[PDB]
Amino acid sequence: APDSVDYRKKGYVTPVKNQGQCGSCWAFSSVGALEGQLKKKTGKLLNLSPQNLVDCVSENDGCGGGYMTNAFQYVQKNRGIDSEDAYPYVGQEESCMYNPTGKAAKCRGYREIPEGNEKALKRAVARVGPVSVAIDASLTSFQFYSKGVYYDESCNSDNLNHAVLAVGYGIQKGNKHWIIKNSWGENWGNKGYILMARNKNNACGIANLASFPKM
Numbered sequence: 344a345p346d347s348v349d350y351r352k353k354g355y356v357t358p359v360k361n362q363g364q365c366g367s368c369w370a371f372s373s374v375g376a377l378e379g380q381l382k383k384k385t386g387k388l389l390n391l392s393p394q395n396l397v398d399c400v401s402e403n404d405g406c407g408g409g410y411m412t413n414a415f416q417y418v419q420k421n422r423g424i425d426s427e428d429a430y431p432y433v434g435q436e437e438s439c440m441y442n443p444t445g446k447a448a449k450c451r452g453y454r455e456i457p458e459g460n461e462k463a464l465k466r467a468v469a470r471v472g473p474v475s476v477a478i479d480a481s482l483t484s485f486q487f488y489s490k491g492v493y494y495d496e497s498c499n500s501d502n503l504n505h506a507v508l509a510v511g512y513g514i515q516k517g518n519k520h521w522i523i524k525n526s527w528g529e530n531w532g533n534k535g536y537i538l539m540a541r542n543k544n545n546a547c548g549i550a551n552l553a554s555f556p557k558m
């Protein structure tokens with residue numbers, strides 16, 4: 344696999360969004376991984392609908408949390424997901440109001456990266472595109488992140504609490520990293536992104552709950 348890759352440079356990554364006061368990170372994460380595969384398949388990037396996921400993935404808990412794999416299963420079984428413009432984000436859980444007329448992507452299944460296996464995650468990022476991941480984002484250090492390759496010795500890999508998107512990987516100042524898209528707005532972190540330590544004992548649980556969609 345390459346030493347580094349950044350899918351933002353290849354046009355696979357939409358603008359940084361802002362989930363607000365709803366535990367919909369799983370839906371943003373799932374949507375970002377779908378956005379990536381849409382670009383790869385069609386050449387054309389479009390924002391997809393986290394609200395569609397929040398409302399219609401009956402296997403998840405809406406603003407009370409969810410699994411990304413459950414969302415990909417839904418998109419596949421549903422024969423599509425709507426675009427953001429067709430099913431705009433409202434920041435609360437609702438009845439399912441999916442409209443097939445606003446379909447902008449499909450899903451042909453998904454895969455899961457072997458638990459905790461950072462080389463495997465690296466290989467999936469290289470071969471596929473952006474890959475949905477979950478981390479411990481509870482630490483004030485993570486939340487105040489501004490620059491550099493984030494590492495905190497107190498980060499707990501067994502306490503996943505936040506779903507984000509790995510959009511590449513590499514190195515900075517000799518510190519191996521993952522490039523992570525958050526859903527806390529552009530005002531957060533580095534223009535909405537964080538570089539997180541890679542190959543440092545699976546820091547923050549980065550490779551503990553990773554998956555990507557097929558298209």
Ligand SMILES: N#CCNC(=O)C1(NC(=O)c2ccc(Br)cc2N)CCCCC1
Pocket residue numbers: 366367368369402403404406407408409410411477478503504505506552
């Ligand atoms: N709120 C909130 C934000 N965090 C979540 O959404 C996560 N998952 C759950 O919390 C969860 C999963 C599946 C189901 Br169903 C219900 C759930 N609350 C995302 C994946 C990693 C664990 C944290």
